[PDB]
From TrEMBL, chains A, B, C, D, E, F:
It comes from the Bacteria. This is Phage tail protein. GO terms for molecular function: structural molecule activity. InterPro entries: CHP02241, Phage_T4_Gp19. Pfam families: Phage_T4_gp19. It comes from Streptomyces coelicolor (strain ATCC BAA-471 / A3(2) / M145). Signal peptide: none annotated.
Automatic annotation (TrEMBL), chains G, H, I, J, K:
This is Pvc16 N-terminal domain-containing protein. Pfam families: Pvc16_N (PF14065). Residues 4-176 form the Pvc16 N-terminal domain. Residues 184-210 are annotated as: Disordered.
Amino acid sequence: PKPEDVLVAPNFGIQIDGVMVEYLNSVSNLQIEQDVIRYQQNQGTTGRNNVTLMPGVAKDGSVQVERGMSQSSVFTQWINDSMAGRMATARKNATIIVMDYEDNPVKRWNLRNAWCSKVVAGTLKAGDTNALTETITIVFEELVVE
Amino acid sequence: PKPEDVLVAPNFGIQIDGVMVEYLNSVSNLQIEQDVIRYQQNQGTTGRNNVTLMPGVAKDGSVQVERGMSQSSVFTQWINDSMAGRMATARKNATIIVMDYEDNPVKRWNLRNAWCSKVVAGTLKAGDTNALTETITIVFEELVVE
Amino acid sequence: PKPEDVLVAPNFGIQIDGVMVEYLNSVSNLQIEQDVIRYQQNQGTTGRNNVTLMPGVAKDGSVQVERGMSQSSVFTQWINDSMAGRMATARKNATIIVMDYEDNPVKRWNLRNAWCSKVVAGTLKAGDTNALTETITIVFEELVVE
Amino acid sequence: PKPEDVLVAPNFGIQIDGVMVEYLNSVSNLQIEQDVIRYQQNQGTTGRNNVTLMPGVAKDGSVQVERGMSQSSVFTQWINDSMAGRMATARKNATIIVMDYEDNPVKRWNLRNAWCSKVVAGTLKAGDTNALTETITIVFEELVVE
Amino acid sequence: PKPEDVLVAPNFGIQIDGVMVEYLNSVSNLQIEQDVIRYQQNQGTTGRNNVTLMPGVAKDGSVQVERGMSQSSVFTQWINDSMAGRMATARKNATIIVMDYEDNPVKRWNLRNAWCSKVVAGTLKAGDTNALTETITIVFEELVVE
Amino acid sequence: PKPEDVLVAPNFGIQIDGVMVEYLNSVSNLQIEQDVIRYQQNQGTTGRNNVTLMPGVAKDGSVQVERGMSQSSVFTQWINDSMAGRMATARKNATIIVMDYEDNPVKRWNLRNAWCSKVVAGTLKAGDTNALTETITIVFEELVVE
Amino acid sequence: MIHEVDEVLKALLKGGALTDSGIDVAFEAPTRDWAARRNAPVVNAYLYDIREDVGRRHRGQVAVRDQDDIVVKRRQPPRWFRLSYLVTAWTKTPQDEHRLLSAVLATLLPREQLPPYELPGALGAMNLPVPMTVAGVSLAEIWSALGGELKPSLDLVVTAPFPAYPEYDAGPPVTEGATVRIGGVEGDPPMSEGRSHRPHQVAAARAARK
Amino acid sequence: MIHEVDEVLKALLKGGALTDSGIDVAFEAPTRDWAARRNAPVVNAYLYDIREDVGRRHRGQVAVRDQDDIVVKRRQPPRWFRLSYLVTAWTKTPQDEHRLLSAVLATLLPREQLPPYELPGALGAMNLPVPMTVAGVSLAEIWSALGGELKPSLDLVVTAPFPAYPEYDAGPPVTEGATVRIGGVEGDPPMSEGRSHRPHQVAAARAARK
Amino acid sequence: MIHEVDEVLKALLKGGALTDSGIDVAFEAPTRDWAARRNAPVVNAYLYDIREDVGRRHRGQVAVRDQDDIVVKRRQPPRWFRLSYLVTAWTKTPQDEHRLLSAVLATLLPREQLPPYELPGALGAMNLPVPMTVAGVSLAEIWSALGGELKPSLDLVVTAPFPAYPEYDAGPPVTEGATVRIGGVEGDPPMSEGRSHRPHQVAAARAARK
Amino acid sequence: MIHEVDEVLKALLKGGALTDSGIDVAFEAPTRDWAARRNAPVVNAYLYDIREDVGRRHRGQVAVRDQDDIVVKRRQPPRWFRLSYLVTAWTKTPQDEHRLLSAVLATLLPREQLPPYELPGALGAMNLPVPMTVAGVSLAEIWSALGGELKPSLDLVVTAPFPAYPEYDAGPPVTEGATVRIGGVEGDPPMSEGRSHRPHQVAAARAARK
Amino acid sequence: MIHEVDEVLKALLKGGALTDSGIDVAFEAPTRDWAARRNAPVVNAYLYDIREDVGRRHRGQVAVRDQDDIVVKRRQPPRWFRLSYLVTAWTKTPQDEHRLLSAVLATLLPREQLPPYELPGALGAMNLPVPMTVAGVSLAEIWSALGGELKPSLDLVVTAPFPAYPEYDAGPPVTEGATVRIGGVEGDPPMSEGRSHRPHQVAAARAARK
């Protein structure tokens, strides 16, 4: 039907080149932001005020991915590669996919020059019922919605 | 009846020139704000204090629109046009309409030189139930209520 | 009976000269305020401390009245007259009356040279049930209780 | 019985010289505070660290009393006297008394040179199932517990 | 049994030399803190980064003992002695004890040169149900756990 | 099975060389941090904007273990050793182990040059029902996951 | 005004999209005894509770004027009351009950508010819109206290404006204008009559009203 | 002072806008047994619970003076208690019940508070307003507690100013003024009588008292 | 569109993994009386309540156009309603009941959203997905409401897209273009017709539509 | 001490404003069976629950000394328990019930606390005030669990200070003073006896006690 | 270990301060049927729920060593469970019931925890204190679900430690010390045996254990 008619369910997925990750528990907000510059001036003759707000540089940042802790240490290896300065292999291209009810990719966010920066272990409490969560802050230089 | 007698229900709509958007889920606050300048002085002969409050300039602002995100990427194309510097076509006149019970326009906020500045995807959760939303921040130089 | 023996119910009203406003949903805090000015000095010969607080100039504020959104645009016209600089007619004298039972005015707050400076429309939501609320910020140079 | 054995109930009261006030709904915290000065030094010979924190000047404060709004305007007259600079009569001595079950004064706090600084009217809202409250912020140069 | 095996119940007590206080209602956190100095350096020949964290000085603190306010004014007399500069008698050694099941002192905190700084009364409310609390802030120079 | 297939339950443990600690009630977040440096540049001949993110030094942190208060004072002796400057024995290597359902260590966090810097006693209340909690802050120059 | 809303609901349900058959709308409490006697497909519209819409209350002295463009009465804004109706469909076959409930939903959805002219005389005298919410947003406890058994139902909310008119009267209009007397605060100069508005000023003020 | 509030409610309901028919106002609990015996249109005003308005409580030694303009007693401000009434209309036909409830709501709406003139002797001796709130915001559990069945109802809240009467007695008035004795703190100069207020000062104070 | 939903549920339950035995799907209320008469393994799919999905509601004038690529109707986005079904399995042996419940969950698991190519005519005309949740997320009170006994159950939530179209008509299309009139604000110069769009401009506008 | 509080309540109710008629105060549970047998106007004071006032608890080794001004015992502060009483009035007429409830409110209002000079021996040995709140601040559930029917009631809360007696005994008093032994930490100089307090120091210490 | 707690409670109640008469402590559910058969003053101690004290849980490999000062077992800290008892006193007279409840409170107050030797072998083997709280914290719902009528009751909470037994077996002790092998990472120099600890170092390490 119409592109606006079909809604999108929270059925998503990720794909990182070189990092073997299949599923995630949640993904933080992905923002496409642009700087805005405001300038106020006065007309030389008449004197009325004109405010002109325009375009800046594209704003990048880092979306966060969290998963269930397990034996696998792909994010550990990623942050270790990034920590030793081997950024020729640490900088990877990522993709975040949001699919329809038929599991056909509807929207894709491509992430250029993305490398993991912060890995956080979930708080371990003695009588905690919930499983343990690992938080990853992937910093990417560019985000291109497709 | 009297203009004050008839109340207004939260039945609204938007019209952006060049962007094919028909319905929204929520709209942020629309403020018409003026700067206030406070000046305190003392009478020269008697010493009494007089504080005067006078006017500033019309303030520019931005209102966020959050729609149920889908396959349609009208706001994506808008922010792409704004990001590459093509501000001749990126700046559009917008209108926010609030209607009565008879679906008859009552208030029409006209928004001059409006271009999208930020597109945010809602947080994605595996066990999420409600639909995943999209937030749009639009900055308008002028907001005249008609 | 005694002046202290009669309590006050939230049965209030407003009256702005030139602005046709009949009823208000709520009114913010209006206070009469003053500046305290501490100064500490030691008594000179013996050294004992002596801090003194003393009166300073009185203060202007900003009483805001909120009214349900309707067709009437009295506040819109007020702020429009404000933004154009025509303050010969924009600066008005206002009164906030609060009365006990039998509809007999008990207390009156007179706002001298009151002038609106901000009009905010309530957030619009599709599933919203409550009526739209308009917030008006009316700043005043002087407030006299009577 | 023992002074520590008998507890204290919130059967409080106030007495202001020149201001005719009988009852209050609540009274804010009354603090007896003293400045503390910390100094760190090292022994000249051995080098061990000694931190000496001592006594400062007593501090003035601002106890606040809130009551039920009524026709009486004793606080209005107090703040009017303070606002006109007539501090010879505006500066009064106040007393806050906390009594026992038999309503025999147990504790007394004396406020020296205390004059009203701020008067705030409670927010007025239509359909509010509560009495209107007036808040009075009274500053004092000295508070002595007796 | 083992020292780790036996748990500790909130059965505590206080002892201030010269101040006749026997029971309290609550005691704030008792922190034994030491400053940490971080220094980052680079190896001269190889360029590797070494961050070293070393020790500072013991820190003084303050604990806010709170009790049921009564006719007794031991803390009032303490703060009065401290307020007039008579610090020879104002500085007292203190002990905070936490005991076992059979009221056997298990943990003891000894407080050196402790004098009360601030005394706060509770919020006297007309419709208040529970008793009236009194808060005491005591500043120290050395807190040694024994 | 697969390393990603087996989840991790909150079954953990600690091991500090020289400090006899067997069990803990909770452990704060363990973060592996790396500084990110953002640099913006413009192409000299074409004028396009390039923003580059690139690695920084590894960051040291502090994880705060907590236990049930008891007679044992291992952390007290640790902080006493650190306070007197005897850091030849105060600096210890620590390990945090997270195991599987077979009580088999799955994840290990090794902490290099770790010494306690803050011991906090839980708030004591007369009517408290829970047990007394001791909070310990341990600072690590280096954290290596294994 | 509760019965006015009832009549409105009955007319809307009978004259809505359910014109295929002569269904019966009843306001009786849907208890077990009531349910054990009915023998025809019916729609129950039982009133459940009455609450005041405190969020739509306005306080102020509304001026009421006659044909002479002069205010003669001072009233107060009406207070809005929320009336809740439990709406159920009763039919022998459960699928028929579901179809009847769907028909009721279809016939009640498009009416967000109510125009004043379609309302009865008592309700239409206010000339104000009457909001109507269907299944906007505990039902087990309501059914248990009612005495019946749990069934799918509609929580129809109707906002009826009850006028809290005190009918306070105002003073007679001022026709001679205002007179100002001036003098000394301490009384050293005797207070004067001070005259009043000139006839031409009064005439101009009267003419400027139009 | 509940035997005055109930009488005021009965007089208001009988003497309000429901003068067309002589309806009966009853305070009996609207249980099933009570509902199964009535045979006439009635209005039930069952008392539900009593609570103290802790938000309107005031503490302070209020002075009570006689005709001599001298305080002779010390008392405490009255404590306000909230009384809740479940108001229902019982009639054979449901539409008649709805119109009776509408009439009751219309006759109870205009009275936000109650002047002491309307109140009886015991409550009117206070010379204080008695707030009366209709509706204004669990009813299923309450109706189950009485054993009755859920019906549309009105929650009438009345704030009765109950008295607190410790009635402390003040000392005799000071007529001969105040006397002050002065001397040395350590007792080196013996304390003197110090005299007292002159008769001129006492006369001036008694004249300025008016 | 509740009958369509229950028909879809019946078809899915019969056509799912429940192929080995022809069990019976019933929408009757699982009360004690209903449970005391059944003698075959059955699946109860009782509808509990209807609620509106306020979070998925969208407001705006949706344009509807004919084959001429010109809008002729203005409607509103559909309103989503949440229908809840209590799903239980009844069999003479508790282990068989557990097996039946496991089979039912097994088939309702992969039904996130129902594609509109298998729904009936009324639901299929929407061409919109119909979300279905089996156990996304009080059950004791709910079971006590019908008078039944607590049993393991599934809370099947279906989001039916009910229509709320006002079908407001739009004006006739503009074929002659736009004409502008210009002049003095105070009327000093006489007004002019100002002409309109040239025919080549209209032709270019009509050609650029494709 | 519950059977101390009950006696105090009975004496207060009998000796208060309920002097005109000798009503009966009963602590029996106001169930339907109990209510169906009484034939005289009575006041029910049924105990509802016992809860410890955790907010008023104090912990510390309180010293207890004999006539010699020397501590001989170590005890703990008493722990306060909140006893709740449901107070109801029963008679043959609702207006008389309201009158009795108002009289009970009037007689219980002026007693915020209870001085220890009228309490029985067990309560009087404490020499501590006993706070009493009448209606400071769910009653439907309490009445349903009790078995009775909802009626207006008073929630009388009494704070009884139950005693926590550890009776920790204290060592014999020090009469010979304190002796100090000094020496080297490593033991290079042998430890000395160091003597003790001189007799005049002990005499001065014993004299300064007074 | 629940039966151990029950035996401890029975011994404490029988051997406490209620030695005047031979009262009977029963753990039977205080339903109406149970209450209608007893004919002697009794104390009911009905345990009604079991919950885990998650706030006192500790995780870690606790080392268990034999007489040789070498660890041979690895266990886990015990997990604490909160057992809650409703304690009631039943006697023919309400004042006697209040007196019995007061006696029970008096005899249960001075025991915050329990010494390990007092408890029987099964719970005394842990050698850990067992907290006991009679102060208490919904009682109406508990009484309704139990079957009996609401009565003044005590909520007694006992924290019983249940050990966990993942008794992992540690490896044999190291007696020959540690041997280290050194060499090149790329294998250019062959790995050497590297020897091990000298006998005198091993002897010194063994002797330093004492």
